Amino acid sequence: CDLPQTHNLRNKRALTLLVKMRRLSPLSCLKDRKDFGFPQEKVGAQQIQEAQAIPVLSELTQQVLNIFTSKDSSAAWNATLLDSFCNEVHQQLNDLKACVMQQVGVQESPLTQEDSLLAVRKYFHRITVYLREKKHSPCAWEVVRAEVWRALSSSVNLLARLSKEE
């Protein structure tokens, strides 16, 4: 992608705000754990190139933003941290979307993109269903925050890996 400036430190700011956002000990929520089927297989650099990664990461960033800007989110988390977290994430999403624009009809491997985009969407759909069935309980929100932390951390590590392989 041709961006004026990449802002990697936004990723560090976002992830550490998310870590800081935690309110409960997950040791209090062990029974609320759930395997969401994070699609590692379809977000790994051993095959995925940056051309496929961009739009998939734009989607993950949008889904993350959708969860933390929701009606129920502002009651669940500290507003100061939450507002800062969404500020960082929204800007990264702006940047990712701009890249997605640049590659409209010139999509490389549209198949693996769409297959990845769908696996990501299903994953977050399972997360949101989980949270609704749990009535947005404090433990369910922790399980979700932790999972999102893991999804973002995997994306950041992937981006780091891809920038090394060049």
Partner 1 sequence: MIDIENEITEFFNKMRDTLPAKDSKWLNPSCMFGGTMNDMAALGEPFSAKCPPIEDSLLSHRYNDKDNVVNWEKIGKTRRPLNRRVKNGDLWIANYTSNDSHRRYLCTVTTKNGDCVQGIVRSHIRKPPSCIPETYELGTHDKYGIDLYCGILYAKHYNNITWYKNNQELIIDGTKYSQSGQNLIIHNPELEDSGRYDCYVHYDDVRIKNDIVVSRCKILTVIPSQDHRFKLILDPKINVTIGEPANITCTAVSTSLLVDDVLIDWENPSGWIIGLDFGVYSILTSSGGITEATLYFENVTEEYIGNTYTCRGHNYYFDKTLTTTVVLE
Residue 124 CA to chain centroid, in angstroms?
A: 9
Residue among 20 and 102 whose Cβ is closer to partner 1:
20
Contact region for Cl ion (CB under 5 A) — 9-17, 28-36, 84-92, 144-152?
9-17
In the complex, the smallest distance separating the C-beta of residue 134 from partner 1, rounded to whole angstroms, is 14
Residue among 49 and 150 whose Cβ is closer to partner 1:
150
Q: How far apart are CA 60 and CA 26, in angstroms?
A: 24
Q: How far apart are CA 121 and CA 46, in angstroms?
A: 22
Residue among 113 and 155 whose Cβ is closer to Cl ion:
155
In the complex, the smallest distance separating the C-beta of residue 121 from partner 1, rounded to whole angstroms, is 6
Q: How far apart are CA 66 and CA 63, in angstroms?
A: 5
Q: Kindly list the residues in this chain that would bind partner 1 in the complex (CB under 8 A).
A: 4-5, 7-9, 12, 15-17, 19-20, 22, 25-27, 29, 33, 35, 38, 40, 55, 58-59, 62, 69-71, 74, 79-80, 83-84, 86-87, 90-91, 94, 100, 110-111, 114-115, 117-118, 121-122, 125, 143, 146-147, 149-150, 153-154, 156-157, 160
In the complex, the smallest distance separating the C-beta of residue 72 from Cl ion, rounded to whole angstroms, is 30
Among residue numbers 2 through 41, which ones bind Zn ion (CB under 5 A)? 7
Residue type, 36: F
Q: How far apart are CA 115 and CA 13, in angstroms?
A: 30
Three-state secondary-structure class, residue 112: helix
Is 12 one of the binding residues for Cl ion (CB under 5 A)? Answer: no
Q: How far apart are CA 151 and CA 158, in angstroms?
A: 11
In the complex, the smallest distance separating the C-beta of residue 49 from partner 1, rounded to whole angstroms, is 18
Nearest to 38 by CA among 133, 130, 124, 113: 124
In the chain, count of helices (H) and strands (E)?
6, 0
Interaction site with Zn ion (CB under 5 A): 7
